[PDB]
């Protein structure tokens, strides 16, 4: 009849209001620190970020335009957003006269689409790596591909394809490319065909901020990013855009027209307001990302991926491009006669989380031939090159086990699956993974206070 | 030289890692519980939802397809999303054989655009209330239907006549400033007459819908979308509900037709989810949907409606004019044109008095103000408190009119009477004294940094 | 074997090379003589036009831009130059304010090149009863404006209200079955209020327009398209007229603004003429346009309008209902609903009686559209159109009888259309009537089927 | 009052319009007193011209395929039905396997109606040398495939990779200047491996195809479109062939009929405002009857032998041909080895009554396109096409001299063309050589402008 008291519904902890969800989060906390997390797009963010994320900021509606009022109901939100904006420019070593940033998109993908909406008309032609996204529904997409021999982006064919196809936009960035990007060559191709040049640096934005990979800002018109990957932030989106005078190519005294179009495109995608708690949490992560500690983290992420890749190749496994210059290694399993799904499935049963991933020369996108392995998340748990060699040995045992099950039971998934049940070798591997994982600290929550202990 | 230990960067609380951001959040925490929050799209959600939001779920990648693995890496998020889905159907009294729900969209707006992508091709015709800017207007062909220019109600006849002429593939109902309920039956008849899909964006009133305090869109609409932080009192997140199973008897329809939304909506959402959903939103939303299904939430929803009614009765008793002369939901739309005031003038002055409202068009610069009850109600306010809010609103517009009668109707001229104004300072102080009397969900006023 | 010599395949007349087709054309020549041709879009063009249509012009390729060279195109260019200048002269247009492109194959592709030249794909278009789902409704975004459902006149206030809400980039005026003139001024005011281009498809009334017997669209429209075989009495061919030169004073228009239609229309037409225009249509149209500028053509246009009025006054005197209760142009829209007869029933009964009309929707199509241009061209005047009025009255009287003795269902009604002496008598009466009028375009003295 | 009907309507063109009469007579002379090497041109038959210029131009029909055979459409429907059955017969098509729509005004609108029937807007299309500015590139997403840059043959491997990356909904084959036959087998392979419909626009060689002198696209394509005036030697008109009946064995295909017919007819009908050109359909029926004649087969074979023989002659003088010769009606002459633009050769040939088309070779056009169909219809044979070869050799020779004596920029180069006795001498031999040959379509003996 009457309402519940505010203290009952509104101030009672999750543990009491919703024991089922609380119990599942606790089980997920334990999962995160009792296995080996090699999903290349995942990180373990800081408690500070998580605290800004889960705060009263989730209550605040704001318009979806860059705030400037700095008074009234938006006084503190506007200040938080101003901090997010400047810390963003600062993290990527950008001059505010030449670069602006919008931190309002909910996530990377709506940020990308808002950017496409700002600068393109519907059906405009777009080229990206292996490019069904809204990108491909509402625009005319055509992929460029890696060189069949080297695994690097085939820049000559990129230029020939762009000249034949005439894209209004060329997208840099990938999810599974283990090398850096020749943004200069991309600029040259884009200039030869009249295209805008945008980088989606989602995966390596943390390496970018740490100046451990080439900066797309040197040559790209627009740079978008999701913020939770190597950046180690909340799940949020950002759009960087050039400001001021255009380099010459073009009418006299041309200035970039990106700012208003992008702000309006984002604004019009933000019905009900942005996630101001994400902006607040992103501000915290951008501060942490500008620190000397974060530069060292980013060097360790690269060093860790290199050391895992050296361990794997030393056992005779094949890496796409024969190594890595970033946070991940792409492992080609075709020379073993294995599918990425099989290795991913058996790894998962041992609490090692990887992603099956297509490799060049795959027949069907239904059966990818590789696995993708990233270092950000376990590096954040404090792992260094030697720990990543142990991870290599865990992976070596998992793939070895996968070969044995396949050879014993068959390559058809139905037959392959027979070797996964009551398999002591799997159970032994899984136990070793848990003992190893349990050796490391965990950011974002206190393992000491977890509900499910060892 | 070496990495910071996990302890240092990773478990240190926000107050030490980032005092500036910690401070601004504390100031914002004070603003939320020391003023009068009438933004119709705002709520104050529960501490429990916030604890789920701010948890290790933010680290978990998932593919962006409805989870069914229940083993391995996704074991626990699959269970969480599964509870979110089932609790969603329960909160809105839906039978799983008839209705499915997708809880993966980041927010309401990409939830809507994914719904449109699933069932429409580019350039298909759409009509909505005041639908033009938005991606909806850019990639589809949109024509607005409108409210009757004298009653403020939706003109159902002109809607039918536009629909018959324009032939939309999709008709959208739901809106942000319409103070009445929706004749969804009529919308269904109009949609059936022209062959349109019928979609409700129930964002603002989903709380009342789940509590069965307003008309259920689900009776008549093919798809219902929602943002979950307004009347529903959840996190900021999105859901897409869609019909499943046999389509109703319809002339010329192929025999044994079944709805085909599920796969199309699932693929469109998945293709909009690069890097995965916000699994912390899904967990926080499963907490809100459990709270929405409580007996206390039905009573919250009745109270929201009663509070809006009673604030409206107070305003009209003072001779103010409300669009349609009352409300059937959580808001009141205040027509300020007979006062010779613009909505921005009241919004501005109110803002300076810690009363947050929204200028809003009525029936080009908006001549009205939208005022919502869900936020203040959530702090426990009842009708008599909304009459006190009414009196605060009455003082603010009285002062607004005084400023305009002394300094002028032009904007720069009006902005003068807003500096060093004792009436403003008196209202502000009184609003704060009043606001400090009420409980506040989500955090503990007691443990706040900036105390009274 | 070897090739037939040129003379055997290439110079032998049609009557020998293809007797079946020859006989078919001769039977059709006879059908055209021995019936009352009331299809409002038809005419009987001149032998001179036909002689230029069927000439060696059909062999000539030209690149498909307005010929300006006057070489291998020396003569086709001069023919086209005459065609353009006669086009301007026939419609009383200053060659400094108007240009005309005469290369489109027909009216439809002319309109679509016009749209292609001034609009982007999916741009919004409004036309009369504009949805047959044409390229206009598929590649652009179309929305009809309509006639007042009670008076049958165009509802100019709903038009404006619809255009303010829909915001067309292009408003098309002109119709196939509208029996009144067009307030182009009001159309311009509506188009100006909503930022729309204004185009008139004057296909049906172009002959009346040239003779200045109806309002001229050129006073107010940006573009004017037309097919040339209707009231204009020419070959089947298309033309696009467009404003050129400085734009006239317009609120919110930059000073010294110019029209920019010419090169976009030319390129759009050129891009649509794969393998070149139909230069025999251009020569034939040149002839028709010369004929349309004559004092005889003005009197013919007056007579077309007098004839449609006289027919309308006759049918109304028998108690029939016409949409808008009359006509101001070449046609009459007969509302058959007060009688319980469908357009198809009246249309089929007339067709059996050698009277060719078209079922037409009115404010199953419940009306018939009847036009005066074709019979007027055989020399018929008002008294002769009143006799057509009587033939039409008899045939609807006979249709109402078949439905009254056999039923309003189609299969039930077709019964009465079998071995009906009344139909046979009406058919013979129409035939004896029609046979006595002259026939342009060929010599009845040389026909194969003179009886 | 109105003119008497006979005065405006039955008088001949020479009386009504002496200006246009004169121009057509001059053009008739230009056609029989020059060398006409436009590969898209032919000289159609008098019999075709008589059906083209007939009372058929007066008849309105709906634009749906005709089936009435009674009343107003009695004879038109019979003409159309003959046209359709003769079209199928001219290309040896089982009427259960193939349908044909004969009402498009011309080739280009036939193509667009085809695309409108089977494509949605923005669907991807691939064709040879396509753009990304026809209505095709404007309303669909087009990407070209190209010929091997060094050999000039279609690069079928790059065609395959391009189609697999681009995923067209429609692949178009056919070309305007490709001097070789088409591997339709390969094209159907490529289309199946990428899910595409396969359309052939056979405009240029449909004459060769009907006579089975080149590969039949009907073996491998879903839809075949054509204009009818080229090698087919008919009227300027268009034709859409579409498959009917059982679909061929496909992997995930229900146990499925072709679905083109109703979609094609509706698209064409929706493009036919005011009705088809029924005189074109009549004239086309004549052309198809003539195409299925044993002499037409001899004509087709002769067109190729003339193209070949002119190729071998120019090649034996040192000139380079794209692909080193021809398998059809044209040769494409690569003039880049001479430092001559196509325009410079076309210009000088034109001053000599030799009409050729500058053409882009494998960025001003680097060669010229030469066709055989037109002069082969005037009866010319191999020895004569070698004489053209010699005329052409003299033209290029004289052109090279002017470029040496005056320069490469047209401004300077042009001075060589003034007061050029060699040019004048060549024109006379051209004209004298032309006068030796018959001409179809009109009697040379009866022209106004005699020798």
């Amino acid at each position: 009849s009457h309402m519940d008291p505010v203290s009952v519904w509104g101030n009672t902890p999750l543990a009491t209001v919703d024991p089922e969800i609380h119990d599942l989060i606790e089980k997920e906390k334990r999962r995160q620190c009792r296995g080996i997390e090699l999903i290349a797009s995942e990180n373990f963010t800081s408690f500070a970020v998580i605290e800004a994320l889960g705060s009263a900021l989730t209550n605040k509606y704001s318009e979806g335009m860059p705030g400037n009022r700095y008074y009234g109901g938006n006084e503190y939100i506007d200040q938080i957003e101003n901090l997010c904006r400047s810390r963003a420019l600062q993290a990527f070593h950008l001059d505010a006269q030449s670069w602006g940033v919008n931190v309002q998109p909910y996530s990377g993908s709506p940020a990308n689409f808002a950017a496409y909406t700002a600068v393109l008309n519907p059906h405009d032609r777009i080229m990206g790596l292996d490019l069904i996204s809204a990108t491909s529904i509402y625009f005319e997409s055509l992929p460029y591909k890696v060189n069949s021999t080297t695994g690097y982006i085939d820049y000559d064919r990129l230029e020939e394809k762009a000249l034949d196809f005439r894209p209004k936009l060329i997208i840099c960035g990938g999810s599974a490319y283990p090398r850096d990007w020749d943004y200069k060559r991309f600029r040259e191709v884009a200039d030869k065909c009249g295209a805008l040049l945008l980088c989606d640096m989602a995966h390596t934005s943390g390496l970018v901020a740490a100046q451990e990979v080439n900066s797309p800002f040197e040559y790209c018109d627009i740079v978008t990013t999701t913020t939770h990957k190597s950046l180690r932030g909340p799940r949020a989106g950002m759009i960087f855009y050039r400001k001021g005078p255009k380099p010459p190519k073009q009418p006299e005294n041309a200035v970039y027209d990106f700012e208003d179009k992008i702000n309006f495109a984002v604004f019009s995608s933000l019905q009900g307001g942005p996630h101001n708690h994400q902006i607040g949490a992103l501000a915290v992560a951008l501060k942490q990302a500008a620190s000397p500690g974060f530069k060292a983290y980013a060097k360790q992420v690269k060093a860790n991926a290199v050391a895992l890749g050296k361990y794997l190749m030393g056992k005779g496994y094949s890496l796409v491009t024969g190594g890595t210059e970033n946070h991940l290694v792409l492992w080609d399993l075709r020379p073993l006669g294995l599918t990425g799904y099989k290795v991913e499935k058996l790894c998962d049963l041992c609490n090692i989380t990887v992603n099956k991933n297509a490799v060049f020369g795959d027949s069907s996108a239904l059966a990818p031939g590789g696995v993708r392995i990233g270092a950000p998340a376990m590096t954040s748990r404090g792992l260094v090159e030697k720990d990543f060699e142990q991870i290599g040995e865990f992976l070596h045992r998992a793939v070895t086990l996968t070969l044995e099950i396949q050879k014993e039971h068959g390559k058809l998934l139905k037959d392959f699956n027979k070797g996964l049940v009551n398999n002591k070798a799997i159970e032994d591997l899984k136990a070793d993974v848990e003992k190893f994982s349990a050796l490391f600290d965990m950011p974002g929550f206190l393992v000491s206070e977890m509900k499910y202990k060892d």
Side-chain angles (χ1 to χ4, degrees), chain A residues 1 3-62 64-68 70 72-96 98-131 133-159 161-248 251 253-270 272-309 311-365 367-392 394-406 408-412 415-421 423 425-454:
Chain A
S1 169
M3 305 179 302
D4 294 339
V6 165
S7 67
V8 189
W9 75 267
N11 297 297
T12 289
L14 177 62
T16 299
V17 169
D18 196 342
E20 319 167 71
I21 288 303
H22 177 264
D23 190 51
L24 285 169
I25 300 180
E26 290 296 329
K27 287 178 185 209
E28 170 57 22
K29 288 165 53 173
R30 171 168 190 76
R31 206 201 48 79
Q32 296 191 17
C33 57
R34 288 302 175 257
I36 297 177
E37 200 86 358
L38 303 172
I39 311 289
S41 65
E42 261 179 2
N43 219 328
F44 300 125
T45 195
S46 74
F47 184 53
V49 166
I50 287 175
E51 278 200 303
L53 182 72
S55 67
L57 291 183
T58 188
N59 295 328
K60 192 46 200 140
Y61 164 84
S62 67
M65 276 301 204
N68 46 15
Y70 290 115
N74 306 283
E75 183 172 343
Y76 311 121
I77 299 299
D78 285 9
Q79 272 162 286
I80 288 168
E81 198 206 332
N82 180 63
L83 274 188
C84 202
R85 290 199 307 261
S86 41
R87 285 169 189 188
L89 293 188
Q90 285 164 6
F92 296 91
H93 316 269
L94 302 182
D95 176 353
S98 323
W99 279 100
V101 59
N102 189 304
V103 299
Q104 315 252 339
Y106 300 122
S107 197
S109 151
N112 279 331
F113 198 65
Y116 306 160
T117 299
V119 305
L120 301 176
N121 304 303
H123 311 290
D124 275 352
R125 286 176 172 191
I126 297 187
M127 287 178 69
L129 189 65
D130 318 326
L131 191 53
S133 34
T135 318
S136 306
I137 311 188
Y138 298 105
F139 297 93
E140 287 307 320
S141 62
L142 189 73
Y144 55 89
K145 308 141 173 232
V146 300
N147 177 316
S148 35
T149 289
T150 64
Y152 292 73
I153 290 147
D154 189 327
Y155 286 97
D156 290 335
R157 291 305 91 71
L158 164 60
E159 172 184 358
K161 276 196 73 152
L163 286 167
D164 179 42
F165 184 80
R166 305 305 290 201
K168 291 235 146 298
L169 172 68
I170 301 184
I171 304 169
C172 301
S175 94
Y177 193 54
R179 297 289 176 163
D180 214 335
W181 290 76
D182 190 333
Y183 298 114
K184 181 199 233 308
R185 187 56 191 292
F186 267 100
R187 168 53 52 189
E188 290 169 10
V189 176
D191 281 352
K192 284 167 141 173
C193 73
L196 286 172
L197 177 54
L198 176 150
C199 175
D200 179 355
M201 62 182 197
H203 262 264
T204 63
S205 72
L207 309 177
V208 168
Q211 305 173 301
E212 289 300 307
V213 296
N214 301 339
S215 169
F217 295 100
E218 170 150 42
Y219 296 112
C220 296
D221 300 292
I222 297 157
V223 179
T224 60
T225 191
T226 225
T227 60
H228 71 277
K229 297 185 172 146
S230 58
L231 202 46
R232 209 154 63 178
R235 297 192 168 247
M238 304 214 267
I239 306 171
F240 297 84
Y241 49 86
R242 264 173 192 204
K243 279 178 29 185
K246 307 219 235 182
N253 307 312
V255 309
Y256 287 109
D257 201 15
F258 292 145
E259 184 165 9
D260 293 316
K261 293 181 184 184
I262 285 180
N263 286 337
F264 186 55
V266 173
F267 167 63
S268 82
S269 78
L270 288 197
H275 291 183
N276 279 313
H277 51 301
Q278 286 165 198
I279 300 171
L282 175 54
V284 175
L286 285 166
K287 167 164 199 249
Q288 300 195 273
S291 74
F294 192 84
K295 174 116 174 134
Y297 165 69
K299 302 159 91 313
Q300 193 62 54
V301 166
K302 296 188 20 210
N304 278 349
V306 162
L308 165 63
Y311 186 86
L312 295 177
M313 288 187 273
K315 303 265 147 194
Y317 297 121
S318 317
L319 307 189
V320 178
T321 76
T324 177
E325 286 151 9
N326 53 30
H327 63 308
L328 61 70
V329 317
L330 189 52
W331 184 355
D332 186 346
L333 306 158
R334 302 171 289 192
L336 316 172
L338 273 179
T339 69
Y341 182 67
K342 290 178 175 95
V343 175
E344 178 200 275
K345 190 180 185 152
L346 180 173
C347 278
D348 184 66
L349 293 178
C350 311
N351 283 357
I352 303 158
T353 54
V354 304
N355 293 116
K356 66 181 161 41
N357 202 96
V359 287
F360 188 111
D362 268 342
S363 318
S364 159
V371 283
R372 191 186 64 166
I373 291 154
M378 303 285 303
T379 305
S380 296
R381 292 195 70 199
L383 275 71
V384 282
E385 298 97 311
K386 181 59 174 305
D387 313 301
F388 266 77
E389 305 171 5
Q390 191 42 247
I391 289 177
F394 283 129
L395 290 167
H396 171 53
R397 288 169 62 186
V399 168
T400 294
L401 193 32
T402 304
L403 291 151
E404 291 176 353
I405 291 154
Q406 168 160 289
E408 184 67 32
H409 309 273
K411 302 181 127 236
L412 297 185
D415 304 318
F416 175 84
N417 280 344
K418 301 174 183 148
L420 304 174
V421 160
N423 195 308
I426 289 180
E427 290 195 88
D428 292 347
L429 182 42
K430 182 186 165 101
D432 289 335
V433 162
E434 301 200 34
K435 298 189 179 86
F436 171 87
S437 183
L439 298 175
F440 295 98
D441 197 1
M442 199 31 216
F445 56 94
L446 296 183
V447 53
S448 49
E449 310 179 324
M450 302 194 350
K451 169 152 164 183
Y452 291 91
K453 14 235 351 168
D454 302 326

